[PDB]
Amino acid sequence: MNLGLWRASITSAEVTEENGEQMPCYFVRVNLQEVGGVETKNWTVPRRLSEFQNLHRKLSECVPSLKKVQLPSLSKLPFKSIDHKFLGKSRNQLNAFLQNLLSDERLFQSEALYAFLSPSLE
Ligand SMILES: [Cl-]
Numbered sequence: 775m776n777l778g779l780w781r782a783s784i785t786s787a788e789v790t791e792e793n794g795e796q797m798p799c800y801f802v803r804v805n806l807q808e809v810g811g812v813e814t815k816n817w818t819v820p821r822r823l824s825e826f827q828n829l830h831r832k833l834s835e836c837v838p839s840l841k842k843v844q845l846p847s848l849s850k851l852p853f854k855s856i857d858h859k860f861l862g863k864s865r866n867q868l869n870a871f872l873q874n875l876l877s878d879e880r881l882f883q884s885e886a887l888y889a890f891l892s893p894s895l896e
Contacts, residue, residue: 775882775883775888776809776882776883777876777881777882777883777884777887777888777891778876778879778882779806779808779809780804780805780806780808780809780876780891781804781805781806781807781808781876782802782803782804782805782872782876782891783802783803783869783872784800784801784802784803784865784868784869784872785801785802785803785818786800786801786865787799787800787801787861787862787864787865788801788861789856789861790820790822792822792824795848796855796856797822797823797824798822798823798846798848798856798860798861798864799820799821799822799823800820800821800822800823800826800864800865800868801818801819801820802818802819802820802821802872802891803816803817803818804816804817804818804819804891804892814893817893819890819891819892819893819894820894821890821894823845823846823848823864823868825890826845826868826871827845829886829887829890830843830845830871832886833875833881833884833886833887836880836881836884836886837878837880837881843871843874845867845868845871846860846863846864846867846868875887
């Protein structure tokens with residue numbers, strides 16, 4: 775495996791239902807053109823904010839400096855519903871997060887990063 779040849783970018787975000795609550799969902803476009811050979815090289819995988827937070831926690835085991843990184847968070851306060859400003863900023867933050875992970879040689883064999891960037895067939 776070499777995730778350092780994988781390119782990923784969040785192309786859009788929307789809200790979905792995870793359990794009972796409104797959950798931001800981010801569409802991650804993944805490109806393996808830099809990988810040679812004959813295989814599937816392009817897809818989009820939707821991931822929920824909660825799946826980014828899970829990924830952060832797992833990768834934080836392998837590389838404990840990642841514990842310092844703050845990801846977007848849903849406000850527990852009353853009247854803090856998800857709006858377009860939060861989706862837009864959370865998307866840019868999560869996108870920057872993906873760029874930073876994929877530039878980090880320590881993760882180029884991360885099974886968790888691989889499973890997160892891989893296709894999701896519900
Ligand atoms: Cl709320």
